[model samples]
Target chain A: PVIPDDFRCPISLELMKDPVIVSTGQTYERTCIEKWLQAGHGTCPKTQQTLTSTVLTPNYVLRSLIAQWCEAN
Target chain B: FGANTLSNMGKDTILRFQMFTKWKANGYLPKKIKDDIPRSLYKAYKIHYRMN
Candidate 1:
C-alpha cells in the first residue's frame, strides 16, 4: 500500500510517527522539526519564512487519518 | 575568525535530538516526566506548500 504523501515528513522522507505543526502551518515529524529548530535556523523548512515562534502543535487529525490508513493497508 | 558556530550548533542540535528521543523512551523515566518532555531541512527554494 502506498503511504499518503502527507503522512510522510518532508524532512525525513518517511512516515511520521509524531507529526507536529509549525508556525508557518507546515506539518513535519516532531523530532525532525525539533532538530531543525534546535540547529538555530529561524525559518520554516517548507515555507522558508521566518518562524513566528518555536512552539509545536500536535496534528492529531492528520495523525488519526494516518493511523486509519495504516490499518486498512 | 574563530571556531565554527554553525558546525557546533549543528552538532549540538543533532545530539540534543538524540537525547530527547532516548529520554522519552527510557523506562526509568516516569510516564509523567515523559509526558512533560516537550520535545531539518530545506536549504533553498522558498514556497508555501499546502495540503488539503
Candidate 2:
C-alpha cells in the first residue's frame, strides 16, 4: 500500500515515521529534513535565513494520521 | 516505506528515529551517548531507502 500523499516526506517521499514543520512553514519528515539541515543548509530546505529559533515542532496532527494509518493497515 | 513488504523494522530502528526526536527536542545529540548509536541509526534508516 502507498503512504497517503499528504503524509509523505518532501525529501524521502517515503512514509514519514516522524514529521516536522520546518522554518519555511513546510512539513517534512523529521529524519529527512535534519539530514538536509546537517548538510550545511542550516537554512530551511524550501530555503531560509539563520533562523531566529532552531526548535522543530512535531506535527502530531499529521503524526496522528500516520499512527491511524499504521493502525488501519 | 510502503507496507507491502518490510525487512528491517525493529526496536533499534525506532530508537534511531527516537535519537532524531531527542536531538530535535534539545537542539543537540547528547554528547554522552556513544557515537556508534547514531552510526547504526543512520545505517538503519539509510537501508529503509532501499526497501523499494
Candidate 3:
C-alpha cells in the first residue's frame, strides 16, 4: 500500500490535500466538501448530520502524515 | 435513537480489506500482530487481490 487507505478523501477518492472534520466526527477533503457546501449543503456528505459550522478546520496532522508517506513512496 | 447504528457491514468490509492488504505487503505489521494471520492475508493478496 503506497498510500494508506485511511488517508483517502472519501469524495474525490484521492489522497486528501486539505482535510477537515465536522461536528458529526467525520473528515473529508476540503475542495471536495467545499463544493458540497457550495451546493447549499448544510450536512455532512456521509453522515447527513446538520453541519454545526460552515468553518472547516484543517486536519493538518493527517495531511502532514499523508505528505510524508507520499514523499517516502 | 434510530437504534443509533446503521448497517456497518460494508464499512467493516472495507476496513478489513485495508488491513488485509497492509499485511500482504509487510508481515506482522502493526508490529504485534500474529504471524499466521499476516501470512494468510498476504497469500490471499498475492493470489487474489493482486489481479485487480
lDDT scores for all predictions? 0.61, 0.57, 0.59
Q: On a 0 to 100 scale, what is the lDDT of residue B23 in model 3?
A: 52
Relative to the true structure, candidate 1 reaches a TM of 0.58
C-alpha RMSD for every candidate: 14.7, 12.9, 11.5
Winner by TM-score = 1
- Candidates arranged by TM-score, highest first: 1, 3, 2
Per-prediction TM-score, chain A only?
A: 0.95, 0.79, 0.87
Model 1, A1-73: lDDT tens per residue? 5666668776555689999998889998899898788778887875568999899999999989998988898
Stretches off by above 4 angstroms in model 2 are A47-52, B1-52
| Model 3, residue pairs in steric clash | none
List DockQ, one per candidate, in order. Answer: 0.06, 0.04, 0.03
Per-residue CA lDDT of model 3 for A1-73, tens digit only, reads: 5555578665544478788987787788887777777768798765557988888888888888888888888
Per-model TM-score, in order, reads 0.58, 0.51, 0.55
Q: Per-residue lDDT of B1-52 in model 2, one digit per residue for the tens?
A: 3242122323323324433443445543334333634464454434333231
lDDT of 3 by residue, B1-49 (tens): 0121212312343334444444545654333444533454333334323
lDDT-wise, the better of 1 and 2 is 1
Q: Tell me which residue pairs clash in candidate 1.
A: none
Docking class of 2: incorrect
Top candidate when judged by lDDT against the true structure: 1
